[PDB]
Amino acid sequence: MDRPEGSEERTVQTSNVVLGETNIESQDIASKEYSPTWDRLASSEVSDEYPMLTDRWLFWKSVKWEVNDSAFGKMLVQEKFPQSWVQMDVNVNNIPRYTNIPNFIPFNIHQYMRADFEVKIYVNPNDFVSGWLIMAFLYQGSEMFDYKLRRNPAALMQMPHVLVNVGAANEATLKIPYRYVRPFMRCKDILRTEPLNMGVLFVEVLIPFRTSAASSAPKSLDVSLFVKMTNAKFTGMVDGSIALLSKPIALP
Amino acid sequence: DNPPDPTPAKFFVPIPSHSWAHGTNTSEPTNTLRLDGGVVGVGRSDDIGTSDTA
Structure with missing residues (x-):
C-alpha cells in the first residue's frame, strides 16, 4: 500500500457481473x-444461445477449511460437474430446480445442452498463514473403473489443474472445453444416466494449512468458487414440468 | 481361344501370419470386418482431436 486507496485493482467484467482481482492468476x-x-x-x-444469461459469472460455494483438519489430500470439494453447480439450488426436500437462477433458466425448458466452463477459485488469507491447494478436473471421472484411486493429490498433479498458494494468495482459473461421449448432455432424468455429468471437480489440500500458535490468529480460511458457461447451446424445447429432477447421488 | 500359359511356377515360403513385432512404417494384410472393402477409417473433425500420444 503506497496510495491513499491501497493499490490498483484489476477488473474482469462479464455480462452484469464484475470481479475484482489483485494478483496474478494461475x-x-x-x-x-x-x-x-x-x-x-x-x-x-x-440451437438457442443465451449469451446475456449464461456468459455471466456465478458464485457457487464457499467451503471452509481449518488448521486442525488439513491432511495431505483432504478433499474440500469433490463434485460431479457441472451437475453440482447447475443443481446447486435445492428446495426443502433437496430436490434441485432450474427455475430460480438466471444462468440456469434455460436448463429448465430444454432437453439437451452443450457448453464450455471456466471455474475460478478465490482464497483471501492474511499474510502470515501458509498453505497450498490444488483444484483439478477429470473428464467423466465418476464412470472410471478405479475412480477412487485417482483422488490422491499425487494423481491430481497429472490431470489439468491449477495451484493456489496461500502465502501469495493468488487467483486460479481452470478452463474446461466441452468434451463428452456424445455431442450433448441431458438436462434432466429422462428416457429410463444422470443429468449434466461431464466430469468431477476436485479441490485437495496439497500442503496442509498452517498458522501461528497465537490464540487470536484465524484457525480457518474460506475458499470460494465461481463458474461460467461459454459457448452454451440448448436444444429440444419442452415443457418445464414434462420431466422431473430427483435428489442427486453423491460421490464416495 | 484358350492359349496355354507355360510360364514356370515360382517358389514361395508358407507362414501362418504377418509380423507380430512391427508397429510402424509398413502395411498389414488383414481381413477387415466392414461392409466396404478398401483402406477405410473412422471419420474425424475438430470435435475429436488428433491422437495425443507423442
Whole structure:
C-alpha cells in the first residue's frame, strides 16, 4: 500500500457481473479448445444461445477449511460437474430446480445442452498463514473403473489443474472445453444416466494449512468458487414440468 | 481361344501370419470386418482431436 486507496485493482467484467482481482492468476486448460462442428449433426432444431444469461459469472460455494483438519489430500470439494453447480439450488426436500437462477433458466425448458466452463477459485488469507491447494478436473471421472484411486493429490498433479498458494494468495482459473461421449448432455432424468455429468471437480489440500500458535490468529480460511458457461447451446424445447429432477447421488 | 500359359511356377515360403513385432512404417494384410472393402477409417473433425500420444 503506497496510495491513499491501497493499490490498483484489476477488473474482469462479464455480462452484469464484475470481479475484482489483485494478483496474478494461475491458469490451465483441460484440453485443446475448438469450435464444435459435428454437434449440428445431432439435432435438426436450431440451437438457442443465451449469451446475456449464461456468459455471466456465478458464485457457487464457499467451503471452509481449518488448521486442525488439513491432511495431505483432504478433499474440500469433490463434485460431479457441472451437475453440482447447475443443481446447486435445492428446495426443502433437496430436490434441485432450474427455475430460480438466471444462468440456469434455460436448463429448465430444454432437453439437451452443450457448453464450455471456466471455474475460478478465490482464497483471501492474511499474510502470515501458509498453505497450498490444488483444484483439478477429470473428464467423466465418476464412470472410471478405479475412480477412487485417482483422488490422491499425487494423481491430481497429472490431470489439468491449477495451484493456489496461500502465502501469495493468488487467483486460479481452470478452463474446461466441452468434451463428452456424445455431442450433448441431458438436462434432466429422462428416457429410463444422470443429468449434466461431464466430469468431477476436485479441490485437495496439497500442503496442509498452517498458522501461528497465537490464540487470536484465524484457525480457518474460506475458499470460494465461481463458474461460467461459454459457448452454451440448448436444444429440444419442452415443457418445464414434462420431466422431473430427483435428489442427486453423491460421490464416495 | 484358350492359349496355354507355360510360364514356370515360382517358389514361395508358407507362414501362418504377418509380423507380430512391427508397429510402424509398413502395411498389414488383414481381413477387415466392414461392409466396404478398401483402406477405410473412422471419420474425424475438430470435435475429436488428433491422437495425443507423442
